Each structure stands twice: as C-alpha cells, then as structure tokens.
C-alpha cells in the first residue's frame, strides 16, 4: 500500500468485504469464478500482479526477458518467501505449472496455459504426454525459462491470473485436499488463512515472511459469503461491512446515490451478462432454436432495470471495449424487437417447435435477488415474444457451477470476466477443447480463425480476426448476450486504496489502509 502523506491511519487496521457466495476452494489448480480468485490474490503470488491502473507489474519476478515473444525467461527476486520462512523458487513454478495441466488434477482453468500456448501443452492436457514435457524449466534457483511453441506477444498478461500462482508440493502430497485448511496451508501472498468457517466467514492474517510485508498496511481481512444483495447492502449500512460486492439490488441503488453519493462507487468493467445455451442439449443442438432464443430476449427491456448503472446492451461475448477489440453490430441488433419475435417465431416452427406444439425450457440461476428478478423477466419476455415456457431453477453457487460443466441443464445465467486484457480471454472459452467451455460449443470453423490469430503478423490483423470469431460465434447463436458489466460497489469512506481503475477489478488488500474514524 501507499499511504499520502497527511492521512492519520486508523490503530486498528482490519476489513470486511462480502464475496459475494461461498467459494469453490483456496486451491488454486481448483478455482474458475471471481469470488475464489479474490480470496486467492490476498493468499498467493504469481509471477507478476496488477498494478492499481490494471497493468502487469513485478510479482515473484522482479525483471523478465523475451525473444520473438516465444522464449521467456523470468528472474524471481531472492528474498520471495512461502509463509514457512522457506524461498519460493523456479522449482516451485516448474511444479505448479506441470500440476495446473495434469488430467488427474481435473483443474477447471487446466486450459489457461495452453491460451499462451506452452511448447508441449495439447499433447499433455489430452494424456497422450507425461507433464514434465511442459515448456517450463528451472536453470537456476531463481530463472523461470517458458518456451512456446509459437509467439505470444500478450503471454505475460496472462501471469497475473491465480491458476497461474505457485504452491506447495509437500503440503499437497502430506495432506491431500485438506492442505488448504487452517494449520496445513502454506502460502506466498501478503496474507495467509486464519479461519474457514464454511457459509460465514474466511479470515486472513497478514504474513511478515511476504518480500514486501514493509507496505502492507492492514492486518486482517475478513471475507464474507452473503449471496443477496440487499442483505450486504443492509449489513454494509447497519456498519459491520467495509466494502460491498460489486452487485446491486436494482431496487435500492437510486436511493443509495442519493443518500451516501460519496461511498457509491461505478466503474468500467471488463464481462459480459449472458444466457448459456447448452448446445449439446436438445433441442438447443438446433442452431434454429438457439437464434430464436438470442432474438426473443428483450435487452432493452433487461437493461432498462440497471439503467441508473449505466450498463449496456449486449450484441456478442467479448466486451466492446477490451483491449485490442474493435466490434461490428450484427444486422438483427438493429432491428425492432417486433422484427426480432417474427424472426424468431419463423425459426422455431421450422424446427417443428409451434403454438400448438410449444417449447418448455428450464433456466438454471445461482442464489442472487438480481438474477431472480432478472430469470423471472427473461421468462416472461420469451413467453411473450416467442411463446417459449421457462421454468426457474436455483442453486447454490459452487453446484450451479459443477452442473454447467456435467451438461445437466438447458439455459443457464452466466457472466464472464475477463483474465487478462486481451480478447482471446473471451474467446478462447468457445474452443472445442476448453475446459472453460460451459456452452458445449464446439465449431471447428471458430476454432480455426482462433488458430490463425497467432499466425498473422500485425496486431490490426489479429483485432480483425477477434472480429470474424465473434460474427461466426454470433451466426451460431451460441449464446444469448444480455448486457455488459459495470463494477459497481459500496466503500466506506474510512476505506483508502481502492481506485475502481482496473478494468478487471484485480483488487490486493496489500493496497488498502483505514483512515482513521
């Protein structure tokens, strides 16, 4: 943290943040949603991190190297240190990386590297090649060398994510899934684990073995798992939370602006609200019936709910404004929506789904009062619109999740932020092969323009092939966008160092401090 000069720091330096739900795992090879890497960015350190603005900056590395974008070599700076007093070396990286692409770890984010493209990689992840041919290796105690097997000008903004972080080989192999707990848990970050107390609290401990312990400025932080919006919000104002999730109640947020304007924060950020289809879920194997659905959805109508927020209506999947995106509009978003109903009424009869024969659909939601009010709209437009039932079914955060991946749903709530700044970080979840892929959409058209984008040799080329992915995934009607993200949250006015300016909201509690009140 940097603290200004002139600021008096409050004698008791602790935070209460809701999470938002309770999460996955601390493991980091077991991970895939915003509220576990939150948690895991106070716990462990990757070879670089988010600077306040977003941008890449030193982590374990301290200075890194690369040749044609395909070699990179990365200097860890000596005094990193595991909350065992012992070094975290190249090894360790070496370790994590062959862990992270494992099949027998069955990571959800075991894809993430093969998006920089790691010499070795497809082979692995497919089990057909053992995991210490990845292209990582330790020269030295202290030199990460990664080769790729093609260049990657963006490899490096990948490194701030948490599947990329390091951790502990004899803390894994002595206690299994139970090394994350309490007193087995061994970690990198300015802060390790005090308590887990599962559906209430997790707290953490700042660690004086972090190399950079010296800025750290808050002591403990306690992250919360409050699913409802309006329960956070109301324990944010009764005075025992610091810093709401970045979700509102739809209901609440005019009163709030007008009421605490000053701790009403709204920024730029980078993800996309969206229904799932299950492509491989009949009848949604029909590209027919997935259009209809994408056209019968009323955006206009779901975006003027949040309007106050300054959300925008959705055409696609990666966010307009990414870093390296220049998007076009497809012909049906210019339409009426009237235009959009008959369009879509055409195509479901074609597929033999009439009036009198009509589809009945289930959409599947995680516990939220925004997205039930926001299911509860999108059912009754599509019975409107396009004469589509849809029933409502909700789960809990972590089962809501494991079922996306078994396939035993049809049309889900889904949002996805982005890892890194760079479109390919949207993109790449519509592989084939992507263990990200929730949609079960596999084109191998799409798939092909993804490989061609590292074989161009301009980056205007490469955005004008991020555009024709997005047109061929929209022609599919892969998914049905709603609208983009807006980061917006309750701080309390004591509450220093949070700026709002990472687009991805890649937030440390190693930046914040209390003033004191």
Known sequence: ADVPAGVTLAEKQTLVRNNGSEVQSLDPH?????????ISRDLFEGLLVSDLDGHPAPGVAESWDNKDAKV??????????????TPVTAQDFVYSWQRSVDPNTASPYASYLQYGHIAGIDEILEGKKPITDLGVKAIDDHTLEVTLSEPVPYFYKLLVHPSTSPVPKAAIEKFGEKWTQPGNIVT??????????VNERIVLERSPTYWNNAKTVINQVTYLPIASEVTDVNRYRSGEIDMTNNSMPIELFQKLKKEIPDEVHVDPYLCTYYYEINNQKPP????????????????????????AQGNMPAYGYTPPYTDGAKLTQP???????????????????????????????????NTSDLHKKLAIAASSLWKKNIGVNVKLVNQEW?????TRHQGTFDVARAGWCADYNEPTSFL??????????????????????????????????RTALYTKAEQQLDKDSAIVPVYYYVNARLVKPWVGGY??????????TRNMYIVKH
């Open 331 to 365: 012909e049906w978003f210019g339409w009426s929506q009237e235009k959009r109903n008959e369009e879509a009424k055409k195509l479901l009869a074609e597929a033999g789904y009439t009036a009198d024969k009509p589809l009945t659909i289930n959409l599947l939601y």
């Open 499 to 508: 700026t709002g300016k990472d687009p991805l909201d890649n937030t440390y």
């Open 284 to 307: 949604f194997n029909d590209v027919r019936v997935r259009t209809a659905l994408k056209l019968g959805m009323d955006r206009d109508i779901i975006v003027n709910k949040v309007k």
């Open 30 to 38: 077991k991970i895939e949603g915003v509220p576990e890497s939150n």
């Open 428 to 461: 790449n979840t519509m592989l084939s092969n992507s263990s990200m892929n929730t949609a079960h959409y596999k084109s191998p058209a799409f798939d092909s323009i993804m490989a061609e984008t590292l074989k161009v040799t301009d980056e205007a080329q």
């Open 188 to 197: 990198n970050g300015a802060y390790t684990l005090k308590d887990w107390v």
């Open 72 to 85: 990179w070599t990365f200097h860890l700076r000596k005094d990193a240190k595991w909350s065992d007093g």
């Open 398 to 402: 972590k089962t809501f999740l494991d």
